Design a protein around this nucleic acid. Structure first.
Ligand SMILES: [Mg+2]
Ligand SMILES: [Mg+2]
Ligand SMILES: [Mg+2]
Ligand SMILES: [Mg+2]
Ligand SMILES: [Mg+2]
Ligand SMILES: [Mg+2]
Ligand SMILES: [Mg+2]
Ligand SMILES: [Mg+2]
Ligand SMILES: [Mg+2]
Ligand SMILES: [Mg+2]
Ligand SMILES: [Mg+2]
Ligand SMILES: [Mg+2]
Ligand SMILES: [Mg+2]
Ligand SMILES: [Mg+2]
Ligand SMILES: [Mg+2]
Ligand SMILES: [Mg+2]
Ligand SMILES: [Mg+2]
Ligand SMILES: [Mg+2]
Ligand SMILES: [Mg+2]
Ligand SMILES: [Mg+2]
Lengths: 130, 219
RNA sequence: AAGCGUGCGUAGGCGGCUUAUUAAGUCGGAUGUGAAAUCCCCGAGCUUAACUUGGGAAUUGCAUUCGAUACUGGUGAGCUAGAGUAUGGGAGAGGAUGGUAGAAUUCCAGGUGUAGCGGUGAAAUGCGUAGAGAUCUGGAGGAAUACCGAUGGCGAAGGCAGCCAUCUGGCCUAAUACUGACGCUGAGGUACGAAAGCAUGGGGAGCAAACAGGAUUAGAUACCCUGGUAGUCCAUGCCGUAAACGAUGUCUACUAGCCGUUGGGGCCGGCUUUAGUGGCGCAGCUAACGCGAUAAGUAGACCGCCUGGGGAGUACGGUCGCAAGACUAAAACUCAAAUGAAUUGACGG
């Protein structure tokens, strides 16, 4: 059934970028919003919205395209439910030699790889984005 | 704005042969036929006409290529009255890619037409010249609109981006700029200036051609 | 080369959303320890180099202790998008049991009637003057259900077709209500699983392995013809295999369109929406062929399986079986290929 939801969101965004959609909606969640805010701060998406219907929330992402091709060229789930990643502050991965980002979950929140390296911590690697 | 409204640039092909890549440039579909919205269609026809005018003002050419067997008369009509190269019968695969080879036929026509009523060809048989006249007619009905071109055109104007796909691919290869009047049943794949509107109507094709020509006359 | 024949489920793996808490995983610090040598880096002595040697770095570990709580886990509390339940309808060769119908074949008795029938490429074997074949009447019996009939339907798969009753399974579909993550997948294990075969007892019309005869043929243990027994059918059990195939494991989400068809819902013959089942085709994917919302695309969860060809799915051991066999499953030896898809020719009874 549906078990990984972070990967399901990443897959929705990837597939909507492949089909030149301008917006992608999905069922919202606290962690999904926390990852969408990081994708927006790094300039990878345009806008993030969360609409409460009555009890089920819906997240809506606005996508960016730069000269035809999409901005998110590659997005990859790294820590699956079947295998979690858990890097340390020294082994934090770099994506495309620092031209891409790595979403990390640390006890200080969800951040990018270089933010966690600056803060001298690092926990679960969620996704590579470029 | 309203001149294309009374022209039938709105009505199009039936709502079963649409290309899904034109759903932005459509408005609705009444009576089982998609109707193009002319509002945002005019704002791009004007840009295409400005591009054609500024291209004719910097001393460049533009090939009018239309051969759908319906607007093949109006294309020659509104082009030869505008001093520009024409394509009326067949898109002649390899006109731009193998332009050097077709030069060897444009020169055969520049020699054959001059060998009919320009060099006073006399002292010959009446039936022997019929074969050479057939050669010249077969060559002219195919290339008589590109004789005064002499080089690769700088722009192109097509009446059916769908029916003239070989020409659009040759342009997208040779790095030329294309302009097309793309209807509902057509792909806007490599048209540099897409102009949504009818590609088969009499008055609409005549309007597109006459407007392009009147923009060419800005010289 | 490689998806178990198909399900169900045990251990296990993995699991929706919100919130409080914890701090096990995870992260950070500190403190012990992680022998020296070796490796690495600076530099020091051998005329240089090997070599010797000072100091570090490293030893990514483990333990203790303190801190951080995003994520995973635990615990409490909630929620309703997954899963399920109740209530009205609908389609259906779903299954099991028992009746019944009509056509036809075969055989039997009688009537008419007389010389062929039958069969083939051509024949012959064969059946006929004891009366065949043809035709009519009556009867007996077994097996299968023309037309409808349909890339139709139902079923987990194997499969399922006249009609009727009885017992029974699932699915679809509309509303309202309810429960509140009750889920997905599953090694072992179990259930079902074509045909052929096997056991016990029946039945036996047609067809027909084996077999017999006639042909053909160089031969003909065949193909063709005339017969024909097991078997095919029923009851009750075994067997457990198939090109058991979509050669495509199950579940979930997402990604242009167009054209059919089956079962429903909605709205005005048409439009839409669902559950199936088909034909194309964008993107993407692919060695290519192709696939393309019924993916072989994009991702995730669990499982099964592959690792050159042969020897070999064989031996030996074991489990199961009445047996036939099935299942699990090697090695020596041997070869430098075997293979897929496409291309250009040539050939084709
Ligand atoms: Mg194979
Ligand atoms: Mg299978
Ligand atoms: Mg369990
Ligand atoms: Mg668990
Ligand atoms: Mg801890
Ligand atoms: Mg040491
Ligand atoms: Mg709970
Ligand atoms: Mg019956
Ligand atoms: Mg409740
Ligand atoms: Mg299961
Ligand atoms: Mg098993
Ligand atoms: Mg026989
Ligand atoms: Mg098998
Ligand atoms: Mg198989
Ligand atoms: Mg359908
Ligand atoms: Mg329907
Ligand atoms: Mg297809
Ligand atoms: Mg798939
Ligand atoms: Mg493949
Ligand atoms: Mg064996």
């Amino acid at each position: 059934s549906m078990q990984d939801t972070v990967a399901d969101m990443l897959t929705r965004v990837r597939n909507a970028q492949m089909a030149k959609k301008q917006t992608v909606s999905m069922p919202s969640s606290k962690l999904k919003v926390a990852i969408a805010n990081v994708l927006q701060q790094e300039g990878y998406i345009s806008n993030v919205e969360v609409a409460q219907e009555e009890t089920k929330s819906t997240l809506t992402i606005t996508l960016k395209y730069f000269e035809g091709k999409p901005v998110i060229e590659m997005v990859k789930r790294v820590s699956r439910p079947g295998l979690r990643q858990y890097r340390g502050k020294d082994k934090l991965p770099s994506v495309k030699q620092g031209l891409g980002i790595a979403i990390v979950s640390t006890s200080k929140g969800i951040m990018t790889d270089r933010a966690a390296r600056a803060a001298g911590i690092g926990g679960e690697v969620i996704a590579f984005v470029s | 704005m309203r001149d294309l409204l009374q022209a039938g640039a709105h009505f199009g092909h039936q709502t079963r042969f649409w290309n899904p890549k034109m759903r932005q440039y459509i408005f609705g579909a009444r009576n089982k036929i998609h109707i193009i919205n002319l509002e945002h269609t005019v704002p791009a026809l004007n840009d295409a006409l400005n591009f054609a005018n500024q291209l004719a003002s910097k001393k460049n050419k533009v090939l009018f290529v239309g051969t759908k067997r319906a607007a093949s008369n109006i294309i020659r009509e509104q082009a030869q009255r505008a001093g520009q190269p024409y394509v009326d019968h067949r898109w002649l695969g390899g006109m731009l890619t193998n332009w050097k080879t077709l030069r060897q036929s444009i020169n055969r026509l520049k020699d054959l037409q001059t060998q009919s009523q320009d060099g006073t060809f006399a002292k010959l048989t009446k039936r022997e010249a019929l074969e050479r006249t057939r050669e010249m007619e077969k060559l002219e009905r195919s290339l008589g609109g590109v004789k005064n071109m002499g080089g690769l055109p700088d722009a192109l104007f097509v009446i059916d981006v769908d029916h003239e796909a070989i020409a659009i691919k040759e342009a997208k290869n040779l790095g030329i700029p294309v302009i097309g009047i793309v209807d509902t049943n057509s792909n806007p794949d490599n048209v540099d200036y897409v102009i949504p509107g009818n590609d088969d109507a009499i008055r609409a094709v005549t309007l597109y051609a006459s407007a392009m020509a009147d923009a060419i006359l800005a010289g």
